Design a protein around this ligand. Structure first.
Ligand code: HEM
Ligand code: ZNH
Lengths: 294, 108
C-alpha cells in the first residue's frame, strides 16, 4: 500500500496576510499574558507544544506528525508525556475562535514559530496546509521521548523523526527556554537564567557549569549546578557522547550557526510527513511585533 | 514625578521572579550572569567593581535615574544595543513603576 500521503491543502482563499494576522494575535497575547509560570510567559510552553504535536511522527508508516492536528482529541491530549501542555492549548483556543478557518495543526505549529521568533530567536520559515484528520488517526501514547535515558537512546529515537546528529543537538537548544515542572514530568528547575529569550545558553551552561547528579522530590535523578540550574539525563548525554560533544562546543562559540541550524531543523520537524504540491506557496517569513512598530 | 511611586511589596515579587536568577538582595552581593544592583541609582552604566560588562554597557555611560531606567526595562537590547542582558522586557507601566519603587528602596 505504501505509507499514507498527507497533501498540504491551503485554507480556502487564504494567503500570507491572513497568517501574519494569526501570528500577531498570538504574539500580542504572549506580551499581554506575561504573568504565567512566575513571569516566563507562555513562550516556552508554545514551542514545547509545537514539538509534541510533531514529535509523534513515525517515518516508516507516516503516522502522526503536525498535519492532523490530533492533539485536540482526548487520547493524545491526556498523554502522560503531554502534561502541562493543556496550558498551551487554553492560550490558543481564544485565538482559534477568532480565526475558525485555520486548522489545528497549523495553529499549534504556528504557535511554536511565533514564540521562538518573539523570544528574539531566528526567523523560522513556516508553511500552511495542514488539514484536520479524525479521531481514528490519533497516535497511541508513548511515541514521545523519555528523559531518564542516554546518548544511544537519543540517537536512535530521533532516527524515527528522520533527524541526524547535527539536527537533534540543534533542536535540543530550545531547552534554553523554560523549565521542568515537578507536577508535570517529575523533574524540577530551569536549564538557564534567561528562560524566555532564545540564546545558546543551553550549550554554554552544559559545558561551563558544575554538574552534580542528585535526586529530586519526585525521586528521579537529574544533574544540578551550584547556580541553581538543571539538566535532564538526555541533556547531559549531549556532552557524554564524543560526536554530540563537538557540535555542542561549536554552538557555544557561534550563536549564528546555531540559529541557522535550529530554523532548518525546527521547520523540518513541524513539516515532517506533509507533502507539498508544486503549486503550493513558498514558505512564509513573518514580521515580528518589533518589526511592525510594537 | 513622571514615574509614579507605588509598590515596594508588589515589586518584591516582580524582582524575585523576573530578576533574582541574577539580581542580588544585599551590598557586597555577588555578580552572577549580571551585577549586584546596590547603589545603581546615582551611578553610571557599567561601573560596578569586579564585573566584566560588554563594551556596549560601559560605553552607553548614562546616569541611572528612575526615568532612563524604565526606558531600559521596556526593551534592554534597543536602549543598549550589544548588551548580553537576556531579558524580554516589562511591557506594562504598572510593572515598571512597581519595580523601580522597590529598586529605589532596596538599592539604597
Ligand atoms: C524585570 C526586571 C529587571 C530589572 C529591574 C532589570 C534591571 C537591570 C539593570 C538596571 C541593569 C544594568 C546594571 C548596570 O549597568 O549597572 C541590569 C543588568 C543585568 N540584569 Fe537585569 N533587569 C531585569 C530582569 C533580569 C532577568 C530576567 C535577568 C536574568 C537572566 C537579568 C539579568 C541581568 C544581567 C545578565 C545583567 C547584565 C547585563 C550586562 O552585563 O550586559 N535581569 N538589569
Ligand atoms: C530527547 C528529547 C527531549 C526530551 C526527553 C525532553 C524533555 C523535556 C521535559 C521532561 C520537559 C519538561 C516538562 C515540564 O513542564 O515539566 C521539557 C520541556 C521543554 N522541552 Zn524538551 N525534551 C526533549 C526535546 C525537546 C525538543 C526537540 C524541543 C524543541 C525544539 C524541546 C523543547 C522544550 C521546551 C521549550 C520546554 C519548556 C516547557 C515549559 O517551560 O513549560 N524539547 N523537555
Amino acid at each position: 500500500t505504501t505509507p499514507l500521503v498527507h497533501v498540504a491543502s491551503v485554507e480556502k482563499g487564504r494567503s500570507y496576510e491572513d497568517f501574519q494576522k494569526v501570528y500577531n494575535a498570538i504574539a500580542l497575547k504572549l506580551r499581554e499574558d506575561d504573568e504565567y509560570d512566575n513571569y516566563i510567559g507562555y513562550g516556552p510552553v508554545l514551542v514545547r507544544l509545537a514539538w509534541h504535536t510533531s514529535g509523534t511522527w513515525d517515518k516508516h508508516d507516516n503516522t502522526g506528525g503536525s498535519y492532523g492536528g490530533t492533539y485536540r482529541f482526548k487520547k493524545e491530549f491526556n498523554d502522560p508525556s503531554n502534561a502541562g501542555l493543556q496550558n498551551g492549548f487554553k492560550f490558543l483556543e481564544p485565538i482559534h475562535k477568532e480565526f475558525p478557518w485555520i486548522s489545528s495543526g497549523d495553529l499549534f505549529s504556528l504557535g511554536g514559530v511565533t514564540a521562538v521568533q518573539e523570544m528574539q530567536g531566528p526567523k523560522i520559515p513556516w508553511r500552511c496546509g495542514r488539514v484536520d484528520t479524525p479521531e481514528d488517526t490519533t497516535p497511541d501514547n508513548g511515541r514521545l521521548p523519555d528523559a531518564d535515558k542516554d546518548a544511544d537512546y537519543v540517537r536512535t529515537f530521533f532516527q524515527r523523526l528522520n533527524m541526524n546528529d547535527r539536527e537533534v543537538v540543534a533542536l535540543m537548544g530550545a531547552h534554553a527556554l523554560g523549565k521542568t515542572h515537578l507536577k508535570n514530568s517529575g523533574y524540577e528547575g530551569p536549564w538557564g537564567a534567561a528562560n524566555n529569550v532564545f540564546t545558546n545558553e543551553f550549550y554554554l551552561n552544559l559545558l561551563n557549569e558544575d554538574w552534580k547528579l542528585e535526586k529530586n522530590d519526585a525521586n528521579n535523578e537529574q544533574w544540578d549546578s551550584k547556580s541553581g540550574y538543571m539538566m535532564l539525563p538526555t541533556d547531559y548525554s549531549l556532552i557524554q557522547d564524543p560526536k554530540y560533544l563537538s557540535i555542542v562546543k561549536e554552538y557555544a562559540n557561534d550563536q549564528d550557526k546555531f540559529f541557522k541550524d535550529f530554523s532548518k531543523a525546527f521547520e523540518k520537524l513541524l513539516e515532517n510527513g506533509i507533502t507539498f504540491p508544486k503549486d503550493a506557496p513558498s514558505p512564509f517569513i513573518f514580521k515580528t511585533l518589533e518589526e511592525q512598530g510594537l | 514625578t513622571e514615574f509614579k511611586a507605588g509598590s515596594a511589596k508588589k515589586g518584591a515579587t516582580l524582582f524575585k521572579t523576573r530578576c533574582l536568577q541574577c539580581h542580588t538582595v544585599e551590598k557586597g552581593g555577588p555578580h552572577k550572569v549580571g551585577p549586584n544592583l546596590h547603589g545603581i541609582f546615582g551611578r553610571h552604566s557599567g561601573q560596578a567593581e569586579g564585573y566584566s560588562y560588554t563594551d556596549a554597557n560601559i560605553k552607553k555611560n548614562v546616569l541611572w535615574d528612575e526615568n532612563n531606567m524604565s526606558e531600559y526595562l521596556t526593551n534592554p537590547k534597543k536602549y543598549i544595543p550589544g548588551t548580553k542582558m537576556a531579558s524580554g522586557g516589562l511591557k506594562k507601566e504598572k510593572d515598571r513603576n512597581d519595580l523601580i519603587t522597590y529598586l529605589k528602596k532596596a538599592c539604597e
